[PDB]
């Protein structure tokens, strides 16, 4: 049979999954208590700002809250992440409910995503970070959100910074390959919070800039799937 | 020729290797003083638990202790770990005969390793635990044994927790993608002790569970080799 | 066109890259200031030793200094790091010179990589450690220097040892999947010091065992290019 927890599939790797009523001796583990204990689960082999923002939409969608965002060292591999994500939530309709959000917009959002043979690039945009962003990077609540990186971490570099050169933008996030925000990627990743016209210009110039340096390198990079804005 | 420090030899990559008497200046970094510094070395490119239950085995039959077990983020790769296993003795002739155990017994464990696409499911069983997975996970000395993972880590969970459900076992060890217990594997892993029947009846409902997640995505998950248990 | 910030290109996959002024809020997590804002960027996919040695050659040859040295765990993986060298200078035509230097010279040092299934060898050598090695190892200054590493861990240990037995060497660096020098790769990473003529003779045997082993495992390890001493 289709055990019950299943619930799909989405690109990169990734798979939707629900616990009815998880074990109390793992409830120490992940944010759990008595009166909430189900769980609802987003794991992926390729990715992690795709899924996030995929489960950032679903937060903001349901009753539920984020129990633990974990990023492998993955993606398959190298050179990013690994993306692991379980929300919360007294009852598990709601959870099923959020997973299955996030599984339909999952792909969406790989669309951001440019691949090829030496690294990628990979620029996300949401206009009200929400739980998801508040719990793994401290994104300013409600307000415009944008993540960037690509591999090798170099690329990365001329990302960022182009981005915070080109407008007004708070910068959020710094993660290097070895500076603990991320897990040993070969990325330089950024996270830049704002009003939404001054986030998408930098995130523009950023994914811009990008390409041109990956195409200098004698690479084609493709989306992936195609982009959001 | 056939240098004396080789042994061979085991599925994933692995190697049995000897050092009659380890430079001293080595001997801060391992255990190791001057009474004591004859090393037997199982390293693999693929897996961990496999080759530790064979190093477990090989503890138990000779007069041999562990210097160090540590586990790259290999595997290769991903999704999983990586395999560094060094035991110390007084006398060469003693760790050479503690390796050609492990590696006798590692592809007998990795039986117990379905591979697929996606990722890779694990159970692994031991009636004694010793040695190794004292260090390892302090797992309860001399009483039955289980360890569980898969990737990518949601499916890692469900196995976990329908272990812990299935039985009465006391939880050893939970270990998340970024939790500091993996080295950023796309796994949940979970240590399991207990009485036999009960180690037993967990591990199997959790394999069981396992596989039915990863065929529910599609996956043709296949040991490897065959199961032990 | 081609940007401005790109400069090539070498094997691994390698870029040198320059930023002219850096962004100021990016300014905290590099080494950077107001008086100090052009960046030189080597980055690559595989290797680190080659890469490092190719750089410390470049300060060597111009007005820069060493910002950052990161290693993911790329390579591509597995079995080994992942390269982000960032270099600071004045003037941006000092970082360029300097990134000009290292992607000159890189390739020539692949040479010392001997790559095949199971894992790799990898020995470098210096008569003048600088900048790099001093930020990255804690080389003693100005002194001949050696970087030895093997896939998987095992053969790592065989060649170490060695090295050591060999001559009449200072041990400067041990490094293992998991005590926290490297960053979970399969290795043992070892780091000499002392007269050039007994570095070399260590560094020789080393590179002698590892291909010895390696070959008994069945693998046919070659470099990639071709060796350096």
Known sequence: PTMTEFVGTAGGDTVGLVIANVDSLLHKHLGLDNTCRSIGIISARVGAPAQMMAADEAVKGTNTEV????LPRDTKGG????????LKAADVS???????????????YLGNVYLCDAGHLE????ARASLIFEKAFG?????????????????????????LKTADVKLITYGSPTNGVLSYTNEILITISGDSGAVLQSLTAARKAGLSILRSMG??????????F
């Open 79 to 86: 050179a990013g992440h690994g993306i692991f994500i379980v």
């Open 94 to 108: 709601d959870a099923r409910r959020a997973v299955e959000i996030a599984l339909k917009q999952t792909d969406k």
């Open 139 to 163: 994104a300013p609540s409600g307000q415009a959100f944008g993540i960037m990186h690509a591999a090798p971490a170099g690329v990365g570099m001329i990302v960022a910074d182009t981005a």
């Open 219 to 228: 690479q084609d990079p493709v989306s992936m799937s195609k982009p959001t």
């Open 123 to 126: 620029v996300q945009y949401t």
């Open 67 to 70: 129990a633990t965002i974990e």
